[PDB]
Write an enzyme that holds these catalytic residues in place. Structure first.
Site, PDB file in Angstrom:
ATOM      1  N   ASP A 107     -17.710  -9.191  -1.241  1.00  0.00           N
ATOM      2  CA  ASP A 107     -16.721  -9.198  -2.311  1.00  0.00           C
ATOM      3  C   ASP A 107     -15.410  -9.826  -1.832  1.00  0.00           C
ATOM      4  OD1 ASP A 107     -15.705  -8.520  -4.970  1.00  0.00           O
ATOM      5  OD2 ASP A 107     -14.668  -6.820  -4.018  1.00  0.00           O
ATOM      6  N   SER A 124     -15.287   5.317  -8.424  1.00  0.00           N
ATOM      7  CA  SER A 124     -14.455   5.252  -7.234  1.00  0.00           C
ATOM      8  C   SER A 124     -13.075   4.779  -7.680  1.00  0.00           C
ATOM      9  CB  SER A 124     -15.085   4.376  -6.188  1.00  0.00           C
ATOM     10  OG  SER A 124     -14.177   4.070  -5.147  1.00  0.00           O
ATOM     11  N   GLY A 178      -6.427   0.796  -7.525  1.00  0.00           N
ATOM     12  CA  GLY A 178      -7.678   0.083  -7.724  1.00  0.00           C
ATOM     13  C   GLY A 178      -8.722   0.997  -8.344  1.00  0.00           C
TER      14      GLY A 178
HETATM   15  N1  LIG Z   1      -1.340  -1.119  -0.875  1.00  0.00           N
HETATM   16  C1  LIG Z   1      -2.640  -0.832  -0.725  1.00  0.00           C
HETATM   17  N2  LIG Z   1      -3.021  -0.349   0.456  1.00  0.00           N
HETATM   18  C2  LIG Z   1      -4.314  -0.065   0.653  1.00  0.00           C
HETATM   19  N3  LIG Z   1      -4.870   0.401   1.811  1.00  0.00           N
HETATM   20  C3  LIG Z   1      -6.220   0.549   1.608  1.00  0.00           C
HETATM   21  C4  LIG Z   1      -6.550   0.188   0.341  1.00  0.00           C
HETATM   22  C5  LIG Z   1      -5.337  -0.213  -0.294  1.00  0.00           C
HETATM   23  C6  LIG Z   1      -4.955  -0.730  -1.580  1.00  0.00           C
HETATM   24  C7  LIG Z   1      -5.877  -0.953  -2.634  1.00  0.00           C
HETATM   25  C8  LIG Z   1      -5.469  -1.466  -3.830  1.00  0.00           C
HETATM   26  C9  LIG Z   1      -4.138  -1.779  -4.045  1.00  0.00           C
HETATM   27  C10 LIG Z   1      -3.210  -1.578  -3.066  1.00  0.00           C
HETATM   28  C11 LIG Z   1      -3.581  -1.050  -1.803  1.00  0.00           C
END
Ligand SMILES: Nc1nc2[nH]ccc2c2ccccc12
Length: 274
Positions: A133, A24, A19
């Site tokens: 959000d 960030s 992400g």
């Molecule tokens: N698999 C994921 N675990 C996550 N745990 C905390 C944020 C996040 C995340 C954020 C974007 C995409 C995938 C994930």
């Protein structure tokens, strides 16, 4: 409570981005010492100037609290110019992917999902956090398991409350709006507000002009429709809170139906999304 590192790469190996943001990024990270995987939010301290102390304060509170339906904050590292929030990595899949993949899907499933979101968001509200959000992309399943819980994966147009769009002062109620919208999509597979011209669309949201249109809504319970109407309420004072929503029969009672609505919901998700 904060660990110190000269360089974060002494601790973690960074793989794919999960992400992004202006300043960030969440990355998939392996802890070199253990093999264990995490989701690590990488934040430049320069982006926090004028708030560093207060943000660190809040993170220090939240590090001690695990909610069942929110990704856990496992650790905080501080390097000379960055902060790293080490989060629980979720492996279960995205919300809509699982619904389209399931062969069977009912209002009771949708209700189970919303009940979890309500619980998470109520907690965030108590702690003084307005998510702002909430959308399907921020909801991930914990595991591939059949019985997996849903989790909010991250917290700080069509899902935004009218009072925001009207550049008016807003509160935790904006999240209850977003939850209503998510529940709308979970029951039919398309968003309640959409138009070509943003002027049309902005106005539709401002006026909270939506319908439970046929044929998609014909086999959906009055109870669900009432539930949604109470959350997608233009007036934030009349709008249900999370606590009120969680008491509604569709959530707390037995009014959610047991009819397999998978075929239509999945067809609409396929047709309305990329
Ligand atoms: N698999 C994921 N675990 C996550 N745990 C905390 C944020 C996040 C995340 C954020 C974007 C995409 C995938 C994930």
């Amino acid at each position: 409570w904060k660990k110190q590192a000269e360089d974060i790469k002494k601790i973690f190996e960074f793989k794919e981005t999960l992400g992004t943001g202006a300043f960030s990024e969440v990355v998939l990270a392996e802890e070199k010492a253990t093999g264990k995987l995490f989701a690590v939010k990488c934040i430049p301290k320069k982006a926090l100037k004028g708030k560093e102390s207060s943000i660190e304060n809040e993170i220090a509170v939240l590090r001690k609290i695990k909610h069942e339906n929110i990704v856990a904050l496992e650790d905080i590292y501080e390097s000379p110019n960055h902060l790293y929030l080490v989060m629980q990595l979720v492996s279960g899949g995205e919300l809509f992917d699982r619904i389209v993949e399931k062969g069977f899907y009912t209002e009771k499933d949708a209700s189970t999902l919303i009940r979890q979101v309500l619980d998470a968001v109520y907690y965030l509200h108590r702690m003084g956090i307005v998510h702002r959000d909430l959308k399907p992309e921020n909801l991930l399943y914990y595991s591939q398991d059949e019985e997996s819980k849903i989790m909010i994966s991250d917290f700080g147009p069509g899902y935004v409350a009218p009072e925001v769009l009207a550049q008016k002062p807003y509160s935790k109620a904006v999240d209850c709006w977003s939850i209503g919208v998510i529940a709308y999509i979970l029951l039919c597979g398309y968003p309640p507000f959409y138009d070509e011209n943003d002027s049309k669309l902005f106005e539709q949201i401002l006026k909270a002009e939506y319908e439970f249109d046929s044929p998609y809504w014909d086999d959906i319970s009055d109870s669900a429709k009432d539930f949604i109407r109470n959350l997608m309420e233009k007036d934030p004072n009349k709008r249900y809170t999370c606590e009120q929503a969680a008491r509604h029969p569709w959530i707390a009672g037995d009014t959610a139906l047991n009819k397999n609505i998978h075929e239509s919901v999945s067809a609409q998700i396929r047709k309305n999304f990329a």
